[PDB]
Amino acid sequence: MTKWNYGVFFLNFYHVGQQEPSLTMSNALETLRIIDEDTSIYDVVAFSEHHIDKSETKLAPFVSLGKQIHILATSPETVVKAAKYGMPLLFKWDDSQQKRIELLNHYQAAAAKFNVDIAGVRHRLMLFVNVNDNPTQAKAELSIYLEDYLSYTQAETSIDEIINSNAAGNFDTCLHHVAEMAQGLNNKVDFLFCFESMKDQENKKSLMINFDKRVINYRKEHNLN
Amino acid sequence: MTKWNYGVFFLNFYHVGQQEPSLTMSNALETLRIIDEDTSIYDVVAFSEHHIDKSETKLAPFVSLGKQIHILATSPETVVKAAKYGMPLLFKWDDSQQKRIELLNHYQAAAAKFNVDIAGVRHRLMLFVNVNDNPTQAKAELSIYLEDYLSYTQAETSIDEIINSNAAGNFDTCLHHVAEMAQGLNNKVDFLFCFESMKDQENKKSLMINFDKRVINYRKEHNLN
């Protein structure tokens, strides 16, 4: 079997959740502290900043995760290019799951044609994660968090789809849904989670630690280290 | 004494050196291969893409190097903000060395005021590196490489300054100049090198390997591991 890797991302947008940018900033810095001090599984950090270019002269939509260069899966066109060079993809949190699957299949078809071996290649899937004992409250909090971003990207009507393709609900449902989406992507995805839509910093911390512990135990149980 | 760290960056711009983007791409992929297969010191990879925003809604000019978040040193204003949060800087290759020094000093002054300890903090300095037995040829190659980028950023007249604040010349002069610029920045900088202005892929490889070997030997000689 295969070890799944987990990392964290932050949405690089100044207006989220009706928060002052200074609060959004201190919240993000606590996430970083939790990564540094309280946990071990969160291997890499990235920033979601594709709302800018979308809003051309780039060599490619490159995203560096450590020293492994991914291509952000921005279009069928873009993933064909990534496959030509055998590079792993980064799937957008703001794409529907069906769309990500479509892009994965475009990619694997392109690699075959170009005789590019992609056997070992593992992609990364960006997901927002909001855990609440009341699932409606989790989805509500994520919706409110994303309001200004979606207004800026002119994608307000895609909010329900975004909610459905990310992880918002109680803890067990979120984990199950994460596993379902991985399964949909042929279990070829590692993850980047964004926890910032959880206002309650103690809840965020508890989540990040609980998940850290679950992953450590899983890896021990299955001898993945 | 302190271990200096080295990484690599690529300029995310489609028109360099009058090269077809496919060639620029295959050149970059060979650099990645050299990092992966022929050397060990190149710890992280980043992309220079600040020609875009410059050409606002970001929470900050964040750059992730692994899981260590840097702030791109885009203005005195921006570095004061980085110091408030005690975060390390990424110095621009396209800034003059005097400018980088000014920004370093702005930063250290801000941290003192805010009682933020920055003792352990190490920044990163982006530099183009072009080594040629004929120093004029190295500077010439770098100039031609950057022509279209500088036209796009409307900074054509800054080319001489850029040459002077990066490493272009014979191998020993480049290394000495890198050391001088570090010294100017109080020896508080690790590095990201961009090797892509060297057209000759064999010369690039030889350089990357020779430098790798020099750093390994240095670390052994001084017990830095």
Curated annotation (Swiss-Prot), chains A, B:
Cofactor(s) listed in the protein's UniProt record: FMN
InterPro entries per the UniProt record, alphabetical: Bacterial_luciferase_CS, Luciferase-like_dom, Luciferase-like_sf, Luciferase_bac/NFP
Cross-referenced Pfam families: Bac_luciferase (PF00296)
Protein name: Non-fluorescent flavoprotein
Keywords attached to this entry: Flavoprotein
CDD domains per the UniProt record, alphabetical: Flavin_utilizing_monoxygenases
Cofactor, how bound (note): Binds 2 FMN per subunit. Each FMN has a myristate attached. This flavin-fatty acid linkage is probably the result of an enzyme-catalyzed reaction, most likely the bioluminescence reaction itself.
One Gene Ontology term of the molecular function aspect: alkanal monooxygenase (FMN-linked) activity
Disulfide bond entries: none
Complexes and interactors: Homodimer.
Family membership noted in the UniProt record: Belongs to the bacterial luciferase oxidoreductase family.
